[PDB]
Design a protein around this nucleic acid. Structure first.
Ligand SMILES: [Mg+2]
Ligand SMILES: [Mg+2]
Ligand SMILES: [Mg+2]
Ligand SMILES: [Mg+2]
Ligand SMILES: [Mg+2]
Ligand SMILES: [Mg+2]
Ligand SMILES: [Mg+2]
Ligand SMILES: [Mg+2]
Ligand SMILES: [Mg+2]
Ligand SMILES: [Mg+2]
Ligand SMILES: [Mg+2]
Ligand SMILES: [Mg+2]
Ligand SMILES: [Mg+2]
Ligand SMILES: [Mg+2]
Ligand SMILES: [Mg+2]
Ligand SMILES: [Mg+2]
Ligand SMILES: [Mg+2]
Ligand SMILES: [Mg+2]
Ligand SMILES: [Mg+2]
Ligand SMILES: [Mg+2]
Ligand SMILES: [Mg+2]
Ligand SMILES: [Mg+2]
Ligand SMILES: [Mg+2]
Ligand SMILES: [Mg+2]
Ligand SMILES: [Mg+2]
Ligand SMILES: [Mg+2]
Ligand SMILES: [Mg+2]
Ligand SMILES: [Mg+2]
Ligand SMILES: [Mg+2]
Ligand SMILES: [Mg+2]
Ligand SMILES: [Mg+2]
Ligand SMILES: [Mg+2]
Ligand SMILES: [Mg+2]
Ligand SMILES: [Mg+2]
Ligand SMILES: [Mg+2]
Lengths: 61, 64, 50, 76
RNA sequence: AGGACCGAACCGACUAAUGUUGAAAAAUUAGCGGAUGACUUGUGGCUGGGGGUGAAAGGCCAAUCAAACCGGGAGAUAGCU
RNA sequence: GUUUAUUAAAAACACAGCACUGUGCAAACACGAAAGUGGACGUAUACGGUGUGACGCCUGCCCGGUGCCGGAAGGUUAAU
RNA sequence: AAUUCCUUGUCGGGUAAGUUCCGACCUGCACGAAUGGCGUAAUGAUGGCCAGGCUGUCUCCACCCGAGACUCAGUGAAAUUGAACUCGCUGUGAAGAUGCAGUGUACCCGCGGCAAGACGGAAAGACCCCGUGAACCUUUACUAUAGCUUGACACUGAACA
RNA sequence: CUUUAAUGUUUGAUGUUCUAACGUUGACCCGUAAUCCGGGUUGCGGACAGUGUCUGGUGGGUAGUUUGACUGGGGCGGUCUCCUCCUAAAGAGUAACGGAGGAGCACGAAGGUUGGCUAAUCCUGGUCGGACAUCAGGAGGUUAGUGCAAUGGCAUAAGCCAGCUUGACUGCGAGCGUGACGGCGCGAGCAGGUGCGAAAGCAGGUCAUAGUGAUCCGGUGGUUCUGAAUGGAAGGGCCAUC
């Protein structure tokens, strides 16, 4: 459920940017680039989430 | 075939005694109010094609 | 932009005129000035000024 | 903030260094303010261009209680 | 009875190997689909190049085609090699 | 069933079926400067165009934009 | 999902183990109702997955029969090619060296084999950019134009409301 | 005039009747043993339909073309002319998709002159009143101000206020700056005529450097310069202007 929340943020994020493409306020370059930071952010938030999960999984097992 | 004259340069330089050409000064055709009287007054007389341009004017006016 | 062009035109015989601009918006009162009419070759009044 | 504009250089400064003989009329200095001031036989024009009112040699001085440069033209 | 079923001739061309200065400018070999049908085939006819024809692929129109071939304008033009 | 003769046989094209639409016959429509001809020696249970694609259950909301079908008091508007 | 970017989403199933598959969830980046939606018996040289049988596909290759390859005789090509007395290294260098420097090594010449190099052969790169290049194709690009459509006048007349 | 109504005059349109142009891809007759065509007879339409010329709309159905360039490949973004400063190496000039900002105006006074005046900032006092509203004094001394970016100037002020005024002037211009050039700028002085000043004198816009647009094509005013036989005229030129 958590990764899912994280990801939903991936989704608005790209949405915002995606949208700053028309209204040419961003170079197609700009755009790729950023969407990548968002990926970086998302992977990171997740790996955290999985550290946590693992911490606990240790307990339960 | 007779070289044909650049019919339009002939309408803008007139050949002069010693050999140069005289022409009218540009910049005196409109947008006039905004220009100085000194300025305009000096663009009234005619003028001699420059050392650098004869080349081109003679080129155009082979029968001048 | 905004500032209209106008002629001021010899009050003497001649059709000769000087040329200038005014702020029509805030100054609608026909401009008017002694200027030199080089035709009559004297200094006459010069009127008109939209 | 988006740079990369400049204006064309107005070709300023001294045109005739001290001692140069000039003809009445010539331009001894171009300048925006009166970096130099007109002295004797030197007119200052309406852009502060200083010129010669007289043929002579160019003379630079610092005169004045304010210690200002002046350009004059001595007859030669 | 049937754009029905298996299967030669016939018509196709799905896969593989060979071949690739080939036996061949598209094939051979083993397998493959159709096989009374919108089937297939001989002879002749008709449709012509911004035109034809096309169960549509921009396919086909004489070993080719996002505009055939031949002759002409013609030594087009080539700030390129 | 068709298709890229010669790298694609397919999920693409076609299909029966469905719908919209045009067409009253010297039909629409198409080949034609035209005459002519096809449509058809047919006649709306016919014929062209377009989309969808057996059959079953079905096919909701929006007509502002853009088409088209109508109306029309007004505004502007061609030759003359 | 022939649609899902994150994505091998999560759960379930199948497996020793399954990024595929099947069944589920809804978080549908970006399904959806004749540009049809969801189903569907049959059909399919159609796409994905599974299993039995099968096996040289494989562990891992062995032997064998045939056509070549090899030798003799006859005939007799090809692409290519500035010229060659045509080695390895390490360096240098228009920057990846048979050819330069240094050095190592090598008696002269075939034959059968193998393809690591000769940036090997073939086609004046198809990608890329350039040219005020070409050509098709699109459209509420520009400009024209066949078609269709509006009116006036002409062929075109007489009465009337 | 409003608004209205009505006979009439003008001009349009709309409808109905007719038949004789015109249509007939109804019928029958002859050429003619012929599905063509022609002529004829008849019926049906009928000045409509249709066609020519002119005209408005529609018109990727078709056609010719256009669709910039810089760029640390191209594209995307950004940029394109002008002005100030730095880079720029103490004359000039000097590049980058180098670092910073501004212009596409404003003003008949914000111009000319003659006379006159002089800021900021802080301290101290005292109405509201504050760190800064006005006033006093002192300090200070141009940090202020300059219509606007930045640089250079400015006290003799170029800063600020008044009076009179139109030099924001017409012809020219020795001489010089700066540009490949087109051009741009500076200029004493000369003639005419002016404004201020008792007068020496100052004034051809504005402290200066941005505030811009070649040529062609026309438009407007002026000048007999030209005027296609001649006199005029159109048109053209010249000067001012859009
Ligand atoms: Mg003129
Ligand atoms: Mg059968
Ligand atoms: Mg095939
Ligand atoms: Mg076979
Ligand atoms: Mg069979
Ligand atoms: Mg045949
Ligand atoms: Mg295609
Ligand atoms: Mg062919
Ligand atoms: Mg062509
Ligand atoms: Mg030719
Ligand atoms: Mg040639
Ligand atoms: Mg089939
Ligand atoms: Mg093929
Ligand atoms: Mg139909
Ligand atoms: Mg379909
Ligand atoms: Mg599934
Ligand atoms: Mg619907
Ligand atoms: Mg479907
Ligand atoms: Mg031999
Ligand atoms: Mg080596
Ligand atoms: Mg090497
Ligand atoms: Mg060998
Ligand atoms: Mg080999
Ligand atoms: Mg090669
Ligand atoms: Mg090449
Ligand atoms: Mg090429
Ligand atoms: Mg076109
Ligand atoms: Mg470019
Ligand atoms: Mg310097
Ligand atoms: Mg230097
Ligand atoms: Mg001032
Ligand atoms: Mg004074
Ligand atoms: Mg105080
Ligand atoms: Mg005449
Ligand atoms: Mg005459």
């Amino acid at each position: 459920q958590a990764r899912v929340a994280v990801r939903n943020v991936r989704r608005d994020a790209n949405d915002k940017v995606k949208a700053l493409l028309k209204d040419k306020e961003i170079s197609e370059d700009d755009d790729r680039r950023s969407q990548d930071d968002v990926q970086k952010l998302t992977d990171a938030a997740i790996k955290k989430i999985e550290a946590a999960l693992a911490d606990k999984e240790a307990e339960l097992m | 075939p007779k070289i044909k004259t650049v019919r339009g340069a002939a309408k803008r330089f007139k050949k002069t005694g010693k050999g140069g050409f005289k022409h009218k000064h540009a910049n005196l055709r409109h947008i006039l109010t905004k220009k100085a009287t000194k300025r305009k007054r000096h663009l009234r007389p005619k003028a001699m094609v420059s050392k650098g341009d004869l080349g081109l004017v003679i080129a155009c006016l082979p029968y001048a | 932009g905004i500032r209209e062009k106008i002629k001021l035109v010899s009050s003497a015989g001649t059709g000769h005129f000087y040329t200038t601009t005014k702020n029509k918006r805030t100054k609608p009162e026909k401009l008017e000035l002694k200027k030199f009419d080089p035709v009559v070759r004297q200094h006459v009044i010069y009127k008109e000024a939209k | 903030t988006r740079n990369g504009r400049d204006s064309e250089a107005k070709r300023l400064g001294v045109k005739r260094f001290g001692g140069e003989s000039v003809l009445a009329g010539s331009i001894i200095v171009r300048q925006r303010g009166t970096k130099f001031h007109a002295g004797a036989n030197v007119g200052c024009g309406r852009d502060h261009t200083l010129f010669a009112k007289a043929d002579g040699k160019v003379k630079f001085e610092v005169k004045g209680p304010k210690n200002r440069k002046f350009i004059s033209i001595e007859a030669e």
